[PDB]
Structure formats: C-alpha cells, structure tokens
C-alpha cells in the first residue's frame, strides 16, 4: 500500500516529539520539540507515558495523528 509517518513521544497533556535541528552555520545539534495533538480513542493514555503515533486524515482543527500503541507507562 503506502506508509504513514510514525513518531514516538511523551504525553504532555491528557505528544512531545523532541528532535534535533543541526545548526546551518555552526554544525552543532540543537534539541527542538514539537507537540503533536493526537487521537486517543478511549482516553487510554496518561501524562508522561511514552507513546507511538501514526499520521491520519484530519480529525479536528488540529488533530492529524492517532495513538496506536503505548510504549512506556507513566
């Protein structure tokens, strides 16, 4: 078929997906994070859990991801 983007992150409100942005001029890696509002269905996950998410069609004004699996419990 085709593959949808997958991320792993920590719940910050019941997902933060911290990544690195290498500096264009100096070459140093700098940590940056982006919050991915995701769809949890039956409110299963809680704050601090490390979760896996997958990209979906728009679900609301800002939700574009579905929580597929919980990796590390809060």
């Amino acid at each position: 078929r085709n593959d949808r983007k997958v991320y792993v992150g920590k719940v910050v409100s019941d997902v933060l997906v911290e990544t690195y942005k290498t500096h264009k001029l100096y070459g140093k890696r700098v940590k940056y994070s982006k919050k991915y509002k995701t769809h949890d269905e039956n409110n299963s996950a809680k704050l601090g859990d490390i979760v896996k998410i997958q990209e979906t069609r728009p679900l609301s004004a800002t939700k574009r991801f579905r929580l597929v699996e919980i990796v590390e419990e809060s």
């Binding site: 500096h23 001029l25 100096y26 140093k28 700098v30």
Partner: protein
Amino acid sequence: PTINQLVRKPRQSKIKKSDSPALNKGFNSKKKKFTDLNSPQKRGVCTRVGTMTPKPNSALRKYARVRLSNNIEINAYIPGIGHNLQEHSVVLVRGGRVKDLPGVRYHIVRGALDTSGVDGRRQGRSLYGTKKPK
C-alpha cells in the same frame, strides 16, 4: 565566544551607511510618503546660491542651496571657474562630498538642465559640461 554562545546569539555585521542619503529617497506626492529608490542624480531648484569659506584652506567656494525633487534641502558645490546659476535655477545634483566644506555633500552637474558648461574649458571637458570646440 563558545559555539553554544554563537548558537544562542549569532554574529551580526555592522550596518553600512550611505554617503549621499538625499539621493536614495523618493517622494510620492499622492500618498505624501517617502520612498527608497537609490537614484544616481536628482533634479532640484536653487534656493540660495553664494559662497562659503573652507575649513588650512582659504577660498570663496561657490555653492547653491537646493530643494531636491524629494523635498529635501541640501548644499551642493558648483565646480569649475564660472557659473550661470541664481535663485530659482533648475539644477541636476549628483553625489560626491567636497572636503574642506562642511555640510556640502553633493555636486551640481555642469552642462545639465539650466547649469551651463564651464566657459573656455579645453581639458577634461566632459567633467564640466563643455562641448568640443571647433
């Protein structure tokens, strides 16, 4: 500084400033606002011709007071020996400050608009707006 300091606060180069600021501005009459255009010359009208004394040097250096087409007042030097300028003359003004004359940052173009060429000039005539003799 450290690499981390440079990442937090990158280098910043000094901003260059223009030696002829009155040439790099336009004026929209309809909107009564100033533009930024970088012209090489500007038309203007002579408000007050006259002379001024230099700063070691000693002379009576001829100049004119000009209101440029962008409604800015400048002091412009009149090069060459003799000129035909007076009040209400229409002149073309170019860049180039004259040392020893404080507050005169521009030159009047000889042989353009109402300014005549220098009379009797035979060497470097194109700098003084003089046609080729004979």
